[PDB]
Structures are given as structure tokens and as C-alpha cells.
Amino acid sequence: GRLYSGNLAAFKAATNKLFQLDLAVIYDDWYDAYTRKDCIRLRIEDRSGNLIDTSTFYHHDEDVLFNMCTDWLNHMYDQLKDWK
Amino acid sequence: GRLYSGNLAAFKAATNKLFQLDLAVIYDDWYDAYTRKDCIRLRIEDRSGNLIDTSTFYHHDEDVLFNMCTDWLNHMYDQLKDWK
Amino acid sequence: GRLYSGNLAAFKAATNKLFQLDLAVIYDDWYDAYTRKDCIRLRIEDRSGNLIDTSTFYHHDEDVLFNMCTDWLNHMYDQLKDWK
Amino acid sequence: GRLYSGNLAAFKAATNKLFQLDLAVIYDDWYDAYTRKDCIRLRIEDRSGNLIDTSTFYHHDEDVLFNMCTDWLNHMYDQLKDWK
Amino acid sequence: QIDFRKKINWHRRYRSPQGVKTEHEILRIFESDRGRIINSPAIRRLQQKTQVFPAVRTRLTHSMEVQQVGRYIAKEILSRLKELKLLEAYGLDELTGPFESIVEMSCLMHDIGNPPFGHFGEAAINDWFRQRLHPEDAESQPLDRCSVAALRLREEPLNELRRKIRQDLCHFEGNAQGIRLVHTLMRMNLTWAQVGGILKYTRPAWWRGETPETHHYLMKKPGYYLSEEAYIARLRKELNLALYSRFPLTWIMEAADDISYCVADLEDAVEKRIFTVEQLYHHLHEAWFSLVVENAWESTEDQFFMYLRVNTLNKLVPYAAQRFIDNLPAIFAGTFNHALLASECSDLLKLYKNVAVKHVFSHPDVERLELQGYRVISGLLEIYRPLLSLSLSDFTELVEKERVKRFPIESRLFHKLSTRHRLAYVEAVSKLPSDSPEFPLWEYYYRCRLLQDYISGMTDLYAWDEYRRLMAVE
Amino acid sequence: QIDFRKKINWHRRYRSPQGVKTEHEILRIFESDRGRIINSPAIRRLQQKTQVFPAVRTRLTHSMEVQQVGRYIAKEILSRLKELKLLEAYGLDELTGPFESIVEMSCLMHDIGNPPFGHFGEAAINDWFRQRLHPEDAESQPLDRCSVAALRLREEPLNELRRKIRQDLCHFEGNAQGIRLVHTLMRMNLTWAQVGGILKYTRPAWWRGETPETHHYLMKKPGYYLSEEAYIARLRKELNLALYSRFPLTWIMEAADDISYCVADLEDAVEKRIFTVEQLYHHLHEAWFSLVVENAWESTEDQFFMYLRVNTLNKLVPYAAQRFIDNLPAIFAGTFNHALLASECSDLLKLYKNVAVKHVFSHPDVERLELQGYRVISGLLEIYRPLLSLSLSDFTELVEKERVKRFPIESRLFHKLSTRHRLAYVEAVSKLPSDSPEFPLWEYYYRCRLLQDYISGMTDLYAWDEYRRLMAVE
Numbered sequence A, B, C, D: 001g002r003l004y005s006g007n008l009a010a011f012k013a014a015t016n017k018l019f020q021l022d023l024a025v026i027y028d029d030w031y032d033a034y035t036r037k038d039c040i041r042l043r044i045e046d047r048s049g050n051l052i053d054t055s056t057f058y059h060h061d062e063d064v065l066f067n068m069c070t071d072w073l074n075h076m077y078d079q080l081k082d083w084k
Numbered sequence E, F: 001q002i003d004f005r006k007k008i009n010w011h012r013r014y015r016s017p018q019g020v021k022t023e024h025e026i027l028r029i030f031e032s033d034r035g036r037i038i039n040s041p042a043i044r045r046l047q048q049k050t051q052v053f054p055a056v057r058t059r060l061t062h063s064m065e066v067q068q069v070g071r072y073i074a075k076e077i078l079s080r081l082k083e084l085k086l087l088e089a090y091g092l093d094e095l096t097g098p099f100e101s102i103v104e105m106s107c108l109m110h111d112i113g114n115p116p117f118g119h120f121g122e123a124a125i126n127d128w129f130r131q132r133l134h135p136e137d138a139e140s141q142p143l144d145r146c147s148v149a150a151l152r153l154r155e156e157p158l159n160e161l162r163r164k165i166r167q168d169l170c171h172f173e174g175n176a177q178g179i180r181l182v183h184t185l186m187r188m189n190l191t192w193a194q195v196g197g198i199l200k201y202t203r204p205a206w207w208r209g210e211t212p213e214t215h216h217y218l219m220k221k222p223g224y225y226l227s228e229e230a231y232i233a234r235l236r237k238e239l240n241l242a243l244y245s246r247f248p249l250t251w252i253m254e255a256a257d258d259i260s261y262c263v264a265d266l267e268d269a270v271e272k273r274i275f276t277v278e279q280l281y282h283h284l285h286e287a288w289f290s291l292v293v294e295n296a297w298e299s300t301e302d303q304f305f306m307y308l309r310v311n312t313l314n315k316l317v318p319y320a321a322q323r324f325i326d327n328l329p330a331i332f333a334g335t336f337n338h339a340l341l342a343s344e345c346s347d348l349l350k351l352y353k354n355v356a357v358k359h360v361f362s363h364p365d366v367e368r369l370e371l372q373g374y375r376v377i378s379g380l381l382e383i384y385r386p387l388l389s390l391s392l393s394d395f396t397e398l399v400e401k402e403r404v405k406r407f408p409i410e411s412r413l414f415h416k417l418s419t420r421h422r423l424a425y426v427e428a429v430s431k432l433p434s435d436s437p438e439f440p441l442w443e444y445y446y447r448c449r450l451l452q453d454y455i456s457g458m459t460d461l462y463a464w465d466e467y468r469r470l471m472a473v474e
């Protein structure tokens, strides 16, 4: 019922990989009212404090939720390395 | 605030001394309603179950109460060895 | 598969009971050749070394064997207290 | 009767010294049939797998045997640094 | 006429289900019994009790193997009756399911009453009491070394109860303690058929004299205590048993225990650096032998026993099934006077038993732990001696008020007894007539039982630690 | 068309039985599997592993409760199909017996691969390796922080194997280790159907990237290692499974584990002087609730959980059976993407989980033993570091001669590894082509696996003692 270590390692690796390109990621988590699922909001910003993108993910299983967070972070990373 | 060992030893010695003369002693203790003091009732009976005497003592200090019980037991013992 | 303590206690009690009447009991045990059962021989003698009686019991279970030994010893005891 | 640590250290140092010049050393040890002495064979080869030299040493004492191995390795090293 | 519907009783003692049921409801009733037994503290406690050596087997793992052997035997017996079309004449047509469950659960809880340290813990309880009551002096006309004034012989009607109480307290047995544990203390409220499967012997613990010749095997050890003379009468009335008779399925649980007796010990020794397989091979060969043990030789230790067990099972289980089927009327009547296992199959077991006795049960480490346990139990029985010297009024006041200024030491010893034991004592005492001359005798008997239950309800480690702590050593 | 005869396979891998069999022979085949599993050292070792608290439950007793829950669920499902006359169309007419046995044995050995200290022992193995190989640097074109010369990226065909080996070694999982334990090391030689019931997840441990949207639940954790890519293909061929699919019966074992998750912990806490029933009553009430928990209130601790468990079972098991029956085609295809347990029955479990998280899993004693185990495993992984720094020729000479005068320290570290692990390594290496450029890579992979197997095959106490002994403290 807990979160497997590999998923957490992948999440941290993605955050470091896209932070070493002069970006920043802010994280928040909470519990939904009636949807009965955990909620994670991520925001990717720059050094100057400007907000570049936001996303929100809903799921009642920790592993699936963190996998979605990691692959979304990877998609943002490679679409910001497509240009600039 | 507790009861000193010597008083308890004297009580037990008196009970054994007057029990070795073919008697028996029954004991009961309780707390008073509004007099704010502990209550001890003693009854001296014979082997045949006949009740010979009763007494009741009231006091809010354990040592004084047990001293009164012991000296009453000694008085009963020597007044039953005055005759019979 | 072992021998219960109560049976051993009964055996020892019987031996002491009938030894305190100026008798003696000698014991020997072995294993049978083909009958596949343990063998116990008891001999009851007197102080003067004269042999009074002998008996032999065969069984493959320890508890039953010791019960037979004990009840035989009791029978000998009370038939020697029938007279003399 | 054992092998002293200094001789082993010298052997390892010689192997590393002549391996850091793009060479390689292969080792094998056994016991002789009737000569009653230990046997050590060394082969010095290159990176490309070509065999450059071989040698074999016989002795019944470990320390002398390893000293001979070490000084032979040093001779090969400095005669391969004489040219090329 | 054999009919198993009159033996498999699914009623209970409290809040018993009544009416007419179907197969599904009976199966549901019998599954709840498994649910209760498996999640009980008594079964959990078995993982801290030593079998032989203090990846070695505890009492829980050994019971988990006896359970498998018994289940396999039961299934073989049931299969052999379908090939003869006798499952409809014998009434087992709609009761096959509970047949295995009763046997399996009886196999599991066949060792819940044994005291700490085993056989040497049972003697210590017996010896210590024999010097307090001296039953041997109550077998004839009144003479006396009894240390209790209310039990010395002086009044025949009271004399009979005196001698019964004096004899019963010196016969402690694990099998007799299991019934008390499952009925009075734990209060599991199991079905009659499940309780009947853990009653192995039928001799009352107060019995004095010679046993009848027709039951000299079923009477070799005590079966139940004097506090259950009313509970066993109802059990015999429910399960249709005569006096001094045994339940049928109990014969299977007895056989499964005998097969798994000395095969695991050898594996424990071989993995405790004692001897090697080669040595073991040599010991067995020089022991006698068929084609049961040779074929298992050809890692190595992990796959030698792993085939020797299968070889011995495939040749021993069918013999047990055949013996059960052949002697069916006598077993069903409950008067069969033998065990299922004078044949070649009985020699192979004696082989293992002899090897284990000669080379395993004589190691110095096993024998020392048998002298230490004797000492520990004897010492623990002597610390609580003050509780057995009080008077009836004093003990009553102590159990009622629970804060006594006259007994500073005894009031603290009494508070270390477990709660359930004290409730058992209170409930047992509250059912006796106060205006009766036999009240002190029963009160003393129940006090001694309470002490015995507390001593025997421990583990080998907790008792050892308490013994060191109460003697101001640790 | 659903047909369970094509799923219940009774063949083996070595010396498999061939031909046509009957019901009795199939039952005999499946009983031997139980006999092998129950008398195995891996199951025995479970009685020295801590569940939560170091009469508290070990891993063996918790598995013995999961087994009962799974058996009850299986019997309920089988009963519900007879009331609809579907046991002949679905092929389960003559296979009811093995249906329960497979589920029960899968429930028993669902925790044999977990390392010592649990979840905090699994991270320590993963972190220590991540600093040695750095898989994150092998996800793109060759750049490198790898500490092994034979695994750094430089040659695409070798690069793919390099990145696969580097990714696999940093994903250690207990479920993936169970298959390796039952197949390669222990060599139990079980039937295909029994092995298929312990394969819970289907993600290869070398998988990099994003999972398909149709399997995002069955891919959430690694399922098997790279050393079993040949054994799982044959398993899928025997049991008729597509790529990335699950065995049907595995859904039941997963549900039984979820029901028995946080009910036992609460009882352990209540018997470890943490809180009282009254407090527990209050915590639960303020938690939310039906008529499941209230009715159990009316000793006391021994008979509150004893009815709360029954209440929760009688309302949760039928829901699981109905969910299994309703979604039968998708489960049989192996592509169902949910678990059997958004309903009112799922809230009651979350209640217990929240209470346990808030009041039990935060006690100071539980958290310290999680910091100590991390330290111990990390320390033990560093003592055996010298074995991972040798060359291929040096390690080959060491494993062959077993008495080397050039490596006095490493030759003594190698002799402490268990024998079966060394035979596993020798057998794995002896099947590779020596004249191939990929030999060193596979040799290093198998050496790392050997070290991981040795570390994860211990108990919490043996590892702790060895850690203190090898550091010259004790």
C-alpha cells in the first residue's frame, strides 16, 4: 500500500534533470472532497519567478499517480528542449 | 502517610495470641460518609460460631486507629483470661 | 512416546510402601528378540536374601507395562498383609 | 611456513607497474609430480591478445619463488622499456 | 448400524443454532470454527515454545505438518469408501467437507496445553505438589503428612471428597489442560464435534486403583480434571458415547502425530552442525530395509529428506487408511483398544526413533536445558507459596477489596496473575453453596488450579525472565 | 469462450508427468505441491521476520490468516456458480479441488522474497547500487559517472545490453525475487499453475519509459528480472497468456491481502500497552458508519476484535465474489485493469488504514527500527565491496581454486556466502558462450545478483548480528 522506491527515484531524477536546465518545479498534494482520490499539482517556473506551466493529476493509487507525474515532467522537459 | 510496620506486627501478634485460646476475630474496614474518618469494626467469636463481642473504632489516622484496635484486643484477651 | 511422571511416581510409591514392611524388590528390564515388546522382570525377596516371588511382564507400551507392574506389586503387598 | 606480505606486495606492484604500460600478465600455479616443488607459470601478453613471452619457475619455498617471479617481471619490464 | 450423522454434531454450548440446516449452512458453521481457532492467542503463543532445540522448528511449524498428514489420511479414507459405494450407507454423503476440517483443526490444537519446558516442566509441577498433599496416605482407613488442615482425614462423606481432591491435584497433564483452556479460560464456544477430537484419553485424573482390562490402552494417562466432570457428561450425551469411550476421528489425529515424530529432529540436527548426511546414511544403514530410504539418496541435504518424507508417506498412509476401514465397527463404538500403527511398517518408525534417541536426544546441550527448566519451574512455584498459606476469609477479602493494608506482600503477588484466570476463579467460586461444610475444600481446590493455570500458561522465555527478575538477579 | 482446463496446468519443468489423468491423480499431483511448500526452509524462516513490532504477529501468522480469507473467498465464488449451473460450461466440473489449493498456496508464499527490515531494507539495496552504475546517464546518446569500465557507454548492439543491465540492477523488488527464489535457488519444481499465482505485476525490471495506457495498473511495479526472460516466456506459452497479462486466480490472492492489512496491527497495539479499547472506540467513531463495527462492542479485548473480524468478513467477502463473477471475461483474458476492491465497502478499509497511519505507524519505537535497518543494510553492502572490484580472471581463479595466496582478504569474504548461491552462480555462468564480446557484462550482472541474493536471504536478527561481528564491536 506504500510507494515503491523506484518511482520516487524516477521522480527525483526527472526534477533534477529539468532543474539543471535553469528551471524550477513546485509541488503540492492534497485529498479530494468526494472523488476519493489523491491530488497532485505541479508547477514549472523559471528563475525570474515567471510561471511557465501548471498541471494537476488525480488518482487513488500512489504508484500510478507518481508515474503520471514523472512522464508529464519528461514530456515538459523534452518539449522545452525542442526549442530554447 | 502510610501505616508503620510495627503497628501491623502488634495487631497480628494480638490476634494470634487471643486466637491460640480457641477464639476467632473477624475484621472489616470502610470509609465514613461525612465524619471524614476511616472506620474499623472488629468482632470476637468462638469456635461454635457464637458471637461474643463487637466493637467499632473511628479515626482519620491509620496508626492511632490500629493502636486502639490492638489495645482493645488486649483488653478483651485479659478480661477473658480473668475467668474461663 | 515417553513415560508419564504419574506412573513412575506410583511405581516408586508401591516399592517404598512394600519395602517399609521389611521386604525388598529387585528390577530388571530388556528388549525381546522377536516379540517386539519391552520386558520387565521383578523379584520380591526378604532381608535374609530368600527369594519369595518372581514375575515377568511383556508389553510394547511403557505406560501399560508400568501400570501392570504397579498393580502386581500392590496385589503382592496386600496378599502378604493378608497373613504374616 | 606462509608467505610474507612484503613479497606479495612487491609482486602486485610489479604487475601494476608493467600493466600501466599497456601490457597484461596471466598467472597459473600447480604442484609438481615428483620434483616435490611448487610450480608457477607467467605469461606476458599485449592488449591485442598476442603472446609476447612466457616463463616457468620451480621451487619448494614460497618466498624464494615469489622473489624470482618479481625480479623476472622487473627484467621483462625494463627490457621492454629499453626500446618500444 | 454405522451412521455418522449421529456423531458429527454442529450444535454449541451457548447460543447454539437450532432447526434444520442444509449443506451450505453446515459448511459455514464449521468454517467459523477455523476462523476462531486460527486467530486465537493460544495458537499464536506456540511460536515461542521449543520443540527440541532452543531455522529450527517451533511447535507451530510441527503442528502445520501434522495437519497436512492428517488431511491426506482423511482424504485417502474418503476416497477408498467411494470405490466401494459406502458413502450413502454410512451417512457421509453430505458431510465430506466437515470430515477433513474436524481432523485438521484437531491436529492443529493438539499441543496447546503443554507447560513451558515440556516434559521436565510437567514433572516439576507434579513433584512440588506431592510434597504438600501426599495422596498416597489417603488410600485406606484414616491414619498423616498433609500440610493443609482442611484436607487431612478425620466422616466418610467428606473423606471421599478429600481423597479425590488430594489425588487430582498431583496429576497434571497437557491433554487434560487443553480442554480446560478451550472451554473455561479462553471461552471459544466451539461445536461438540470439534471438542470431541481433542479428548485423547479417558481416565479421570482422580482415578485410584486398577483399570479394567478392556480399556488398558485408553486409560494409560489422565484425560480430564475434576472441574470438568459436568462438562464431559454433556459431551458424552451429545456425541452418543458410553462411559470410558473415545471419539472416532481422534484415531486419525493420533496416527498423524506418530508419523511426524522423529523425522524433523534429524533434519534439525543435520543443520545444526552435529553430523553429516554421510554419517546419517551410515547410522541408518547399520540401524536395521525395503526400498523406502535407499531411493531418496540418488544441494543435497535440501533434497534428501525432501524425498525420504514422500517415500515414507506413500507407504505409511494407505496402511493407516486400511486399518481404519477394516476395524470400523469397533472404532465407531469407541471401544477399540489399539492404535492404527507388529508389521513391517511399524519397524521403519522404530528405526528413526532409535537413531534419534541414540544420537540426538543425548547431546549435552539438550540435557542442560532440561535441568535448567526443572530448576526454574520449581523456583517459580516457591515464590507464590505465600498465596497458598492464607485463610479463606483473608483470600476473600484480598480478591474483593483489591487494596489491603494487612498483607503488603501477598496483595502484590496476587496482582501479577492474568485477568482471565482471576475471572475464572471468581466464576467458579460464585456457583457453590455457601451454607455447606464442603466450601473450604472446593475453594482450596480452585485456588490450586488457578496457580497451576498461571504457571502452565507461560512461554519458556517469559518464565525464565520472570524467574531471574523476581530473585533480584537482573 | 471461458474454459478453465486450458488454465489449470498440472505439468512441471523437470520430469513432468505425461499422458491422460483422472481426478484422483490430479488431486494427488496438487497435494504434493503443498507437501513441498509447507516443509521448505523458506517458509520456516518466516517466523523470525518482523511484520510491524519487533504474542505479536510474525510474517508466518499473517500469511496463515490471508490463507483462510482467500480460501473462504474461493469457496464462496465456487458456491455462487453452482446456483447458476455454470460449473459445466466453464470447465470447473472436475477441477474444484485444485482451485482452492492454488489460491491457498499462493496466499501462503506471497512474502518469501522480501528483504530483512522490509521497506527500508529495499531502499538501501537500491540506493547503494544507484551510486555505482547511474542508470539515468544511459537513457540517451553516449555522453559518464559509471564506476565499472565494462559498462560505460562507448557500438549500439553492446550499448543496448549495457543500458539494460544498468537499469535492471537498481530495481530490486520482493515479488520479482520470489520467482527467482522458487525457481533457481531453492529448486522446488512446482507446477505451472502454482507459479503463475505468485506473478502479481508484469513490468520487466529493465523497462524504461512510459507504460501503455491499457495496463497502467499492472505495470506500476517491477515484476521479474532480466535473468528470467526465458523462464517467463515458457510460462506464458504454457498458461496461454499474452504479453503483459496476469493469471486469473492472482486477483483473489491480491484481495485477501488487502482485507487483512490493518486489522491485526490494531490488536497488536492494544496488547502492547499503547492505547485502550475505549480510546480505540473513540478514534474509530471520530474517524468517519453502518452496522459493522458498532455491533461488535456489545474478557473484552479478546472478544471485540473476535467479532469485528467476523462482521467485516461477512460484508466484504460476497462483494469480492460478485466482482469476480461479474467481470469474468476480462479477468480470464488477463487484461482487467483494476482491483476487486468507489463503493461503501471501500470506505471501511480506508477507515482502518487512516487510524493505523495516525496512531500506530508513528510511534517512536517503530520509526527507530527503520533507521537502524537502513544503516545495517547499507553497512553490510559496503563490507563486501572488495568482491565487486576484482577482475574477471581473478574472480574465476578464486571460484575455481578456492585457496588463493594472492588475495588473503577476498578469499575469506567469498567463503561466507551460502553454498546454494555459489552453485546458482556457477550454473548461470556455465551456459554462456566464452568466445563472445558480451561475456564480461553477463559475468558482472550475475555477480551483482549473487550479492543481492545473499543480502536479501537473511533474517533481521542474523543480519544485525553479522553487522556487529564484522565491525569488531561484539
Ligand SMILES: Nc1nc2c(ncn2[C@H]2C[C@H](O)[C@@H](COP(=O)(O)OP(=O)(O)OP(=O)(O)O)O2)c(=O)[nH]1
Pocket: A001, A002, F052, F119, F257, F260, F261, F262, F361, F366
Ligand atoms: N512500519 C510501517 N508499516 C507500514 C506502513 N504502512 C503500511 N505498513 C505495513 C502494513 C502492511 O501490512 C505491511 C505491508 O504492506 P506494504 O504497504 O508494505 O505493501 P504490500 O507489500 O502489501 O504491497 P504490495 O502488494 O507488495 O505492493 O506494511 C508504514 O508507514 N510503516
Ligand SMILES: Nc1nc2c(ncn2[C@H]2C[C@H](O)[C@@H](COP(=O)(O)OP(=O)(O)OP(=O)(O)O)O2)c(=O)[nH]1
Pocket: B001, B002
Ligand atoms: N511506592 C509508594 N510510595 C508511596 C505510597 N504511599 C505514599 N508513597 C510515597 C509518597 C510520599 O511522598 C512518600 C513518603 O511518604 P510516606 O507515606 O512513606 O510517609 P512519610 O515518611 O512522609 O511519613 P512520616 O512523617 O515519616 O510518618 O511515599 C505507596 O503506596 N507506594
Ligand SMILES: Nc1nc2c(ncn2[C@H]2C[C@H](O)[C@@H](COP(=O)(O)OP(=O)(O)OP(=O)(O)O)O2)c(=O)[nH]1
Pocket: C001, C002, E052, E119, E257, E260, E261, E262, E361, E366
Ligand atoms: N528432549 C527430548 N525430547 C524427546 C525425547 N523423547 C522424545 N522427544 C520428543 C520427540 C517428540 O516429537 C516430542 C513429543 O513427544 P513425547 O514423547 O513427549 O510425547 P507425546 O506428547 O507425543 O505423547 P502423547 O501422545 O502426549 O502421550 O518429544 C527425549 O528423551 N528428550
Ligand SMILES: Nc1nc2c(ncn2[C@H]2C[C@H](O)[C@@H](COP(=O)(O)OP(=O)(O)OP(=O)(O)O)O2)c(=O)[nH]1
Pocket: D001, D002
Ligand atoms: N590461522 C592460520 N594459522 C596458520 C596458517 N598456516 C600456518 N599457521 C600456523 C601454524 C604455525 O604454527 C603458525 C606460525 O607459522 P607461520 O606459518 O605463521 O610462520 P613462522 O613464523 O613459523 O615462520 P618464520 O620462520 O617466521 O618465517 O601459524 C594459516 O593459514 N592460518
Ligand SMILES: [Mg+2]
Pocket: E062, E066, E110, E111, E257
Ligand atoms: Mg505433536
Ligand SMILES: [Mg+2]
Pocket: F062, F066, F110, F111, F257
Ligand atoms: Mg501480506
